[PDB]
Each structure stands twice: as C-alpha cells, then as structure tokens.
C-alpha cells in the first residue's frame, strides 16, 4: 500500500523513475492517468502498458465509450474503470505538436487532474506527441493543484526532468 520513493518537486507534485503499471499494482491508487489519443486506442507507450496489464479489458471498455461519445477533444478526458490497476482510469489527451495541435491545450489536459484528489500519472504530450518534456512538467506544476505522483519509466528523461527543475530553482 502507499506511494514511496517519490522526489517532492512542489507541495503537490511528486516524481519517481518507475513503470506506472508497477506503481499502480503496488499502491492500487484511486486514479491512474492514461496518456491517451482521441480514439482511446491503447497501442503503445503508457496506454499500451496499462491496457496490457488489464488483459485488454481497458481497450474493450474504451471502444464501448467511443461508440457512444465519438472521439475525445484534444485537451479533453474521460473517467473509465481502473480495472485491476486503480479504482478509476483518467484518460487524458494532450496535444500532439507533430500534427500542429496547439501547445496551449496542454494546459487544458492537465486541468482535468483538478477533478481528482490524488493521481498516479505520466508526463503528458511527451514521446510521440513531441512536446518539450521540461515544458510539460512546468505546465503540470503551474496548472495542477491536487496531489500528482508522476511515474517516468525512462531513466534519462527522469534525470533530465529532475536536474532541469532544480537548475531553474
Ligand atoms: N518515460 C516515459 C513514458 C512511458 C512509456 C511507458 C511508460 C510506463 N510504463 N510508465 C511510465 N512512463 N512510461 O511516459 C511518457 C508519456 O508521454 C513518455 O515520455 C513515455 O516514454
């Protein structure tokens, strides 16, 4: 039970070099955040790792939701089951700047976290979404007021995030 091994960046933002799936299985948090696309297709990265850990139950539930909803908006979210990982999964769509989606929508994406007391989360709009990860962490720190536990799988990205956050003091 309980989050451990996090570096406290602000009063409400914590960060750890860890697999978000391993964190969820250890802690069983109320909310785990998925780094989603508008169609909630959980093919790769965080989304793939979460869906795999649910043995595809997350994808089947996502497909049912999108059939009633249509695609999410960029900057938008939905609350679905956290299945065996968490009580809830908050699927959030950050902007993909590779497709010329507006970086400002990254503010809208993180704003969704404020509807949840505590979240286990990845960094939004990094990897294939092509946003500057150091900017993403700044938007998170400036936008989120609830407790967020950031799980960053890649050691090199984690070290870059932590040392750039400390160097700006
Ligand atoms: N680091 C990292 C990643 C990632 C991929 C897979 C995982 C995982 N299993 N746990 C946590 N993080 N994680 O999260 C960010 C999401 O935009 C990107 O930088 C990804 O590369």
Domain residue spans of the chain: 1-169
Q: How far is the CA of 50 from the centre of ligand 1 (A)?
A: 11
**Is the distance from CB of 11 to CB of 144 less than 8 angstroms?**
no
DSSP 34: E
DSSP 102-120: -TTHHHHHHHGGGGSSEEE
Site of tokens 């890649």: 154
| Cα–Cα dist 29/87, whole Å | 7
The residues, ordered by sequence, that sit 6+ positions from 139 with a Cβ below 8 Å of its Cβ are 106, 107, 110, 124
Distance CA 156, CA 88 (A): 29
Pairing of strands 88-93, 77-81: antiparallel
Please indicate whether residue 46, judged by its CB atom, sits closer than 6 Å to ligand 1. Answer: yes
Sole residue written with tokens 């090199």: 156
Say what the alpha-carbon torsion angle 98, 167, 122, 29 is, to the nearest 10 degrees: -170
The DSSP element (H or E) to which 20 belongs, if any, is: helix 20-27
- 156: tokens are 């090199």
Instruction: Please name the helix (run of DSSP H) or strand (run of DSSP E) that holds residue 66, with its range, or none.
Output: helix 57-69
In whole angstroms, give the CA distance from residue 111 to residue 113.
5
The experimental method is: X-ray
- 153-166 per-residue burial string, b: 16 or more CB within 10 A, e: under 16: beeebbeebbeebe
Residues across the chain? 169
Neighbour count for residue 149 (Cβ, 10 Å): 22
Ligand 1 mean position, distance from CA 151 (Å): 8
Residue in 153, 155, 158, 161 to alter for ligand 1 test, most ligand atoms within 8 A of Cβ: 153
* Residue 23 neighbours by CB under 8 Å, 6+ apart: 3, 16, 29, 120, 149, 151
The alpha carbon dihedral of 31, 101, 159, 22 has a sign of positive
């Amino acid at each position: 039970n309980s989050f451990s091994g996090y570096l406290k960046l602000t009063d409400n933002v914590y960060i750890k070099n860890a697999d978000i799936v391993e964190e969820a299985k250890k802690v069983k948090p109320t909310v785990v955040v998925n780094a989603a696309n508008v169609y909630l297709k959980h093919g790769g990265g965080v989304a793939g790792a979460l869906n795999k850990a649910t043995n595809n139950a997350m994808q089947v539930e996502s497909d049912d939701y999108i059939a009633t909803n249509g695609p999410l908006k960029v900057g938008g979210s939905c609350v679905l089951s956290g299945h065996n990982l968490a009580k809830h999964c908050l699927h959030v769509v950050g902007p993909n700047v590779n497709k010329g989606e507006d970086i400002q929508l990254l503010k809208s994406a993180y704003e969704n976290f404020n509807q949840h007391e505590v979240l286990l989360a990845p960094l939004l709009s990094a990897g294939i979404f092509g946003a500057d990860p150091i900017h993403s962490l700044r938007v998170c720190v400036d936008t989120v007021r609830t407790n967020v536990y950031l799980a960053v799988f890649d050691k090199n990205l984690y070290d870059k995030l932590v040392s750039s956050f400390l160097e700006m003091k």
